[PDB]
Structures are given as C-alpha cells and as structure tokens.
C-alpha cells in the first residue's frame, strides 16, 4: 500500500487520484496544491503549485482525453486551472468571478467538453469552459441565499425534444446551500442559462455536499449530506417525475457529515463524517441501505 506522510504541514482538505491512478493531487490551508507521482507502491513529489491566497478547499481532475489537467478552488474566491506538459506543471487559466470563497469545483461529463461547475459562499454558481484555442465566457446564476457549499453534475443523457420532434441533451446539476436546501438545475437554450427545476427540502441545517450518482441505471440517485447529522438519499424514477426522499439510516449520525462520494458503478456510497470515520453503504434486496465496509483508521 502507498503511504504519504506529511504532504503538508497544515490541514489537508482534499486528495484526489487522477483517472489512471498514477498522479495524486493534494491541497491545504497552506495555500498550495501538491502533485505526487504514484507508480506501483512508490511515490514522489513532482511539483508544488502556488497561486492561491487562502486555503485551497478542493481539486478535481479533468478527463484524460483533454490531457493532464487539474482544477483548484479556494477561500480567495478563485478557481485555478493547471496543466502538465512534458513532465512539468504550470498555471493555464484563472476563473475569478466570485466575491467570496469558492467551495467546490467539478469537471462536467466529457460529453460537454472541458467545462467547469463552480460553487461559492457569495450565493452564486458559475459554469465556465476551458480552452486554449478560443475565448471563454462564464454563466453566473444566483443559486442559494446564504451560500453554496457544493455543486455536482448529473450524468450526460439524451432526452426527447418535443418542439422539434427530435433529440436534445439535458444538462443538469445539483447544488447544496447554507440555506438547508438542495436544488436541481437544467440548462435552457431559450433562457440561455441554467434554470431551477426542483427544490428539495429535507435537511434542518447547512448542506455540506451533494453527489449525483453516475449510475447507468434509469432511476436517478442523489446523496445529500448535512450538519443536521443526516444523509438523505434522493431518487427519481423518471426524468420528468418527482423526487423520493429517504434517510440513509433512521438515526442521526454521531457528528456532522462533510463529504459524499459514489463509486464509479454507482451502487456504493462513501460518507466522510465528523466522527473521523468513512462509512460505505449499499442497498439490500428490499432497497434499504446497509453497511458495505468501513475505514476508521
């Protein structure tokens, strides 16, 4: 097993393997990103990335067909985009539109091209492209009252296009805000922006994370995670129908819940909590969620 001790002297907020599992990216209150090479059981520091002016909260890798590209977000309200060329790292883009902390950044399904979803404490969400061959332009929407803690893409899907009797793609994402709400957003070519599809109420305190399952199955799954110490699982039988709400388990968790992440096949849910434990969950025959393993080290 690969162990990395002391990647930062300060708090580590995120660590993410790239697609081939041979680079690791880590980020800290020390305002830096670090890129580690992982080849077999060994590891080595490749480069430290400086640029942010406050703690870096999250990072996300872009799909390998776009090359070797990382995105970072920070308390300083900026999103930075980094590329690896001929072994060396550098900064290639800056997304600086928000007037308060940027809490999450996430690359969209590769079907949309290199495109970013960005969530901020200023209450807004932004979506901007990455290009080296052209001019970009952000779409900025007012999402949540007190602030947005998290935003996550739904999988690419094709839907029926009525107005023209053909097929159009439906781009959706989900957001979670300091207003205790979860919201679904859908791009609308007429409005030229993302518009509110649904408002899901269930939590009694800030929503810290939302993760839309990449399940290839027809039903849709969302996991939302709150400071109310609960995890809500949202399902939708039909693209155009209502959302079902279900508590992962009937009783409050011991501490606050922080992150939620689905496995690639979309059946396993891993929860990061305040009790400093990661818990895995999956459905039984009757559809009830049950322990699927743990990491409590």
């Amino acid at each position: 097993m690969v162990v990395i001790a002391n990647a930062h002297n300060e708090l580590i907020h995120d660590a993410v393997l790239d697609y081939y599992g041979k680079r690791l990216a880590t980020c800290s209150s020390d305002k830096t990103i670090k890129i580690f090479e992982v080849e077999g059981e060994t590891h080595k520091l490749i480069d430290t990335l400086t640029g942010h002016e406050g703690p870096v909260w999250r990072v996300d890798w872009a799909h390998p067909k776009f090359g070797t590209i990382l995105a970072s977000c920070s308390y300083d309200g900026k999103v930075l985009i980094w590329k690896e060329e001929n072994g060396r790292w550098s900064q290639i883009a800056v997304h600086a539109v928000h007037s308060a902390s940027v809490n999450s950044v996430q690359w969209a399904p590769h079907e949309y091209g290199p495109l970013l979803l960005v969530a901020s404490s200023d209450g807004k969400v932004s979506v901007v492209e990455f290009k080296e061959n052209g001019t970009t332009s952000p779409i900025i929407i007012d999402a949540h009252a007190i602030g947005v803690n998290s935003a996550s893409w739904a999988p690419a899907t094709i839907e029926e296009d009525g107005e023209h009797n053909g097929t159009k793609e439906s781009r959706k994402f989900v957001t979670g805000g300091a207003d205790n709400l979860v919201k679904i957003w859908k791009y609308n070519s007429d409005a030229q922006t993302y518009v509110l599809e649904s408002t899901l109420e269930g939590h009694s305190d800030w929503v810290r994370d939302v993760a839309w399952s990449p399940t290839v199955l027809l039903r849709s799954y969302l996991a939302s995670v709150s400071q109310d110490r609960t995890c809500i699982i949202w399902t939708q039988d039909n693209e155009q129908g209502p959302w079902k709400k279900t508590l992962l388990k009937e009783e409050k968790f011991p501490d606050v819940l922080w992150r939620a992440s689905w496995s690639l096949s979309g059946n396993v849910l891993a929860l990061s909590g305040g009790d400093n434990k990661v818990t895995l969950w999956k459905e039984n025959l009757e559809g009830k969620w049950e322990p699927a393993g743990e990491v409590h080290q």
């Binding site: 097993m1 990395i4 001790a5 599992g21 979309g266 990661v278 459905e283 039984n284 990491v295």
Partner: protein, 381 residues
C-alpha cells in the same frame, strides 16, 4: 479549522483516503482492500442468452450458489432462489412449486389423526316443506332474487348456493361469505380458495384493502395461501405449464396487494410464478403497480435473478429479450470493472452492443444506453 476524512474512488481500481488520528497520512490502496468481491458475481456463467452459453454451467452454478449461501447463512430466505431454479429445470409441477412456498406435509399427520364420528345434534338450518314449496314456486315464476332472499333468511345455505348458481358468480360469492361468516381465520382461507376457482379473485382480494384485520392475515400468510391455490389446480397432461386464467388473475391481483404493503420480495415471488414479464408498463390495467425488477435493482441478487429470469423466457424462440433491464445489465458490466474483472466485462459490453443496436436509433433509451455503454467500454481499456 478541523481536519476531516477524505475518500475518493479512481477509475484505476484504486482508492485514496485519509482518516484523522484518534502530521496526517494519505493512503492509496487497491479497491479490494476496502471492498471484497463476492464470489457470486465472479462465478456467474457469463451473459446468459449469449448463445456460447450451455444450460449446464447455469443449472450447476445455481446448485452451488444456493448450497453455499444457505449453508453459510441459514437465515437467508431462499424461496426466490429455489423458485427460479425450478422454472429453469422444466421439471415444473404445480405441486412442487406449492410445496416450496409452504410444505403441506406438516398437516398430513393431523389429518391421519383419529376423528370422532358420532351422530350430532342439529346446529344448522334447512328449509321445511312450506319454504321448500315457496322456493320451487318462486323458480317456476322466474324469481331468482325472491328465491335467494328466502333461502338466506332461513339460513339454508345449501339451496342458497344452488339458487345462487343460476344467477352468476356474483351472488354465488355473497352466499359463500354469509355461510362462512354468519357464525375464524378459517373462514378467510376457505372463502378465498372458493372465490379463486370461480373467477372472483378480484373481488375476494379487493376485500382485504378495506379490512385491516383480514389484510394483516393475508399479508402474513401469503405463502400458504398461494400454495393452497396452486396445489388445487386441475392437472392437465396436455398442457402442464399453462396457467388457469382465474389463477393467473389471482396471482397478479395478490401480487399487487403485497406490493402495496411493501412486500416487494413476496410480490416478486408471485409475479414470477404467473410469468409476469419484466417491464415498465403497469402489469395490471386497473392499477399502477409495475414489475421492474426482482427485488431492489441495486443489489447483486437482483442483477443475477433478473438475467436468469430473462434466460428462462428465452426458451420460447419468439421471445426477444427485455428492455427494462438493459440499464441493469450495463450496471452489471460496470460492477465487473470495479472488481477488476475486465475480461467478463467486455463479454457484456460487446453482447450489449449488438443488443442495443437492435433498437431504433431514434429512441431515448437507445441513445442514452449507447452513450453509457461507450463510457463503460472506454473504461475497460
């Protein structure tokens, strides 16, 4: 200002996590030191219906799996497992299916027991000569309703039944109820059995919804109820696998009811016996209940059961696969990827490709499945 856990999945069958101590360490490990692959998915005989398939491997695989499962975990309800095994074997006698749901043999001892055959005092009623004449005269004048009313008011349920037979299944049923309930669970059971083989299963079952006392009984004893019905089916040597229409009606109606009480497993058991196809179209017109998958779709059992159930339908050459479960098959292939089983993985993506390309390239399901299939296929190389 607090150190939190970190966990992320990788497309490379690796995982990254960090768990704050009770200097913070980050670990990267193969997904199987976290998740341990069931031998179930690994041993399953590739994609069924894929014609490189021999019904051998499957029949044996079910034996093995069922043995290991029950042996290692006695508490696991194996009804569905064993039911699907039977139907897979063509050795399907209604009596065998019945005995699987509920074993009537426990009753054979009670029946063999000594019974007092002593002459009894009168405890029922019977029309006297007068009333008997009235009934005849009523019938001679074509008055069914007046004849029945008189037989019931004198509590003579024999002629009541007779007269009732001249009037249709409807009032026939009402007479059955009055005879049983006039003056416990005994009545409920007998009533249902007699209703089913008359065509009043719809009526009989619709009664549960209104009575919380009888609905609790029905849902609690569904196994022995269905078993009673099946074991009373007239054996037809010509066609043994065909289901009496009135029995098919009962199964579906009974299933619907069970679903309405969250007994999805029980419902699926009945839906299988009746040979209800897996699809999104509400199995019954008068209700919304659908049969989308045997048990929760996200479970491994469901993946396998669903594909086995499909294989069984495949016997009939006219039959052409299911659509509602294609997503589940792709999800299956995805699950193989995560368990580092790229080999069987492509066996599925490939088969599924031809499977999907045999659909209208204009449909929503087609385009979506195609995209999703590409993504998984890409990941497997």
């Amino acid at each position: 200002r607090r150190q939190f856990p970190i966990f992320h999945w990788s497309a490379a069958n690796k995982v990254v996590y960090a768990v704050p101590p009770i200097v913070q360490e980050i670990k990267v490990t193969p997904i199987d030191q976290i998740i341990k692959p069931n031998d179930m998915l690994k041993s399953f005989p590739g994609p069924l219906g894929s014609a490189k398939l021999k019904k051998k491997d499957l029949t044996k695989w079910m034996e093995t799996t069922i043995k290991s499962i029950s042996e290692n975990e006695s508490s696991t309800d194996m009804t569905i497992w064993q039911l699907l095994e039977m139907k897979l074997n063509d050795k399907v006698n209604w009596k065998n299916i019945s005995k699987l749901l509920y074993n009537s043999d426990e009753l054979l001892m009670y029946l063999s027991q000594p019974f007092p055959n002593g002459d009894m005092i009168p405890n029922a009623y019977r029309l006297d000569i007068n009333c008997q004449m009235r009934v005849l005269a009523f019938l001679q004048t074509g008055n069914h309703d007046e004849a029945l009313r008189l037989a019931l008011s004198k509590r003579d349920y024999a002629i009541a039944l007779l007269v009732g037979s001249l009037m249709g299944k409807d009032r026939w049923s009402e007479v059955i109820q009055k005879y049983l309930y006039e003056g416990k669970e005994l009545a409920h059971f007998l009533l249902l059995i007699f209703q089913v083989f008359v065509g009043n299963s719809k009526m009989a079952i619709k009664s549960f919804y209104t009575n919380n006392e009888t609905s609790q009984w029905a849902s609690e004893n569904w196994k022995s109820i269905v078993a009673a019905v099946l074991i009373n089916i007239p054996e037809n040597n010509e066609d043994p696998l065909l289901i009496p229409p009135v029995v098919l009606e009962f199964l579906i109606e009974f299933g619907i009811f069970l679903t309405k009480k969250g007994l999805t497993a029980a419902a699926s058991t009945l839906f299988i016996i009746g040979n209800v196809p897996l699809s999104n179209e509400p199995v019954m017109a008068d209700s919304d209940v659908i049969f989308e998958s045997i048990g929760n779709m996200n479970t491994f059992e469901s993946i396998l059961w669903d594909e086995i159930y499909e294989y069984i339908f495949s016997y009939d050459p006219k039959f052409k696969g299911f659509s509602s479960i294609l997503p589940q098959k792709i999800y299956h292939a995805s699950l193989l990827q995560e368990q580092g089983l790229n080999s069987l993985g492509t066996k599925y993506t490939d088969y599924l490709s031809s499977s999907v390309r045999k659909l209208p390239k204009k449909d929503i399901l087609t385009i979506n499945l195609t995209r999703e299939l590409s993504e998984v296929a890409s990941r497997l190389s």
